[PDB]
Amino acid sequence: ASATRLIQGLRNWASGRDLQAKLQLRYQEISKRTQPPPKLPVGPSHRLSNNYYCAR
Amino acid sequence: SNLIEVFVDGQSVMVEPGTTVLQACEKVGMQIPRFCYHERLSVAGNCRMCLVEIEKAPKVVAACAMPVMKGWNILTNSEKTKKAREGVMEFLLANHPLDCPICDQGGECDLQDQSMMFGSDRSRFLEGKRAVEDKNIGPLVKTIMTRCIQCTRCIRFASEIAGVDDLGTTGRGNDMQVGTYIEKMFMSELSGNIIDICPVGALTSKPYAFTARPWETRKTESIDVMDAVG
Numbered sequence: 001a002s003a004t005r006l007i008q009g010l011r012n013w014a015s016g017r018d019l020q021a022k023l024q025l026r027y028q029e030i031s032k033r034t035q036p037p038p039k040l041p042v043g044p045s046h047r048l049s050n051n052y053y054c055a056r
Numbered sequence: 057s058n059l060i061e062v063f064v065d066g067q068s069v070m071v072e073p074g075t076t077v078l079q080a081c082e083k084v085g086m087q088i089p090r091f092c093y094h095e096r097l098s099v100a101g102n103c104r105m106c107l108v109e110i111e112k113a114p115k116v117v118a119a120c121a122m123p124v125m126k127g128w129n130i131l132t133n134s135e136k137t138k139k140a141r142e143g144v145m146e147f148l149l150a151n152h153p154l155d156c157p158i159c160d161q162g163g164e165c166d167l168q169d170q171s172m173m174f175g176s177d178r179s180r181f182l183e184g185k186r187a188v189e190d191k192n193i194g195p196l197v198k199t200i201m202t203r204c205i206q207c208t209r210c211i212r213f214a215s216e217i218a219g220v221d222d223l224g225t226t227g228r229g230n231d232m233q234v235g236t237y238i239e240k241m242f243m244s245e246l247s248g249n250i251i252d253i254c255p256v257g258a259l260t261s262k263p264y265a266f267t268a269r270p271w272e273t274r275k276t277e278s279i280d281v282m283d284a285v286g
């Protein structure tokens with residue numbers, strides 16, 4: 001963005017694909033870094049009393 | 057005449073009388089995961105890793121001291137055999153510390169190889185892990201007795217081939233310090249052989265102690281000198 005509407009209309013008239021909508025230069029759509037810290041699962045193991053490795 | 061039949065996993069073979077299961081399994085090419093057995097010492101049924109299921113048996117017998125009766129059928133790779141090995145390996149890795157980097161038998165442990173090829177992978181035992189105070193057995197043998205699994209191999213070693221009898225078991229239960237009570241230097245000839253008898257990283261070399269690691273070094277054939285025996 002940060003351009004006037006005259007050259008914007010020239011860009012839209014040079015190719016009609018709504019150039020203001022999808023501009024390939026993202027500003028604050030980026031998800032924020034330094035996220036809340038993750039907790040991670042353990043899958044179909046770590047439940048005790050059955051899981052012999054001889055079985056699986 | 058001097059021949060007894062076993063079906064080692066259904067494979068029949070003739071065995072000399074008086075011998076036991078493990079010698080028959082090495083006769084047929086099998087191994088059995090073992091700790092306290094050694095092929096130069098006495099047989100003392102302590103390790104319990106050597107178990108094997110025989111058919112028509114409610115228990116699972118140890119493959120060191122059981123004599124070969126006539127016409128066995130030995131299941132080396134049955135179900136509860138592997139279950140028992142997983143159980144006993146999971147017992148062995150409760151009181152053994154996390155010294156796998158700083159130990160001296162990285163590639164040359166036995167706990168590590170047997171715990172891969174026969175042991176479990178998910179552990180238990182959230183709290184505990186006793187610690188044992190080390191001794192100074194001598195300035196030639198570094199000694200951290202916490203890595204000792206009380207496998208009772210150096211004792212029979214000394215009491216037969218050294219005859220010195222300075223290493224004994226002290227205590228009961230979980231608390232069995234194996235060593236010399238009186239802090240005397242265990243020093244005799246063939247004392248250097250004890251650091252290879254020790255199947256874990258508990259009795260190790262003093263001048264070599266933190267200088268190498270077995271996978272980098274290469275082996276080379278050679279003949280002894282300084283002695284007329286070689």
Ligand code: SF4
Binds near residue numbers: 207210254255
């Ligand atoms: S010091 Fe080593 S050889 Fe002796 S009982 Fe302990 S683990 Fe076995």
Ligand code: SF4
Binds near residue numbers: 168203
């Ligand atoms: S003796 Fe084996 S299991 Fe124990 S710390 Fe050393 S390498 Fe690890």
Ligand code: FES
Binds near residue numbers: 091100104119
């Ligand atoms: S060898 Fe049979 S008990 Fe250790």
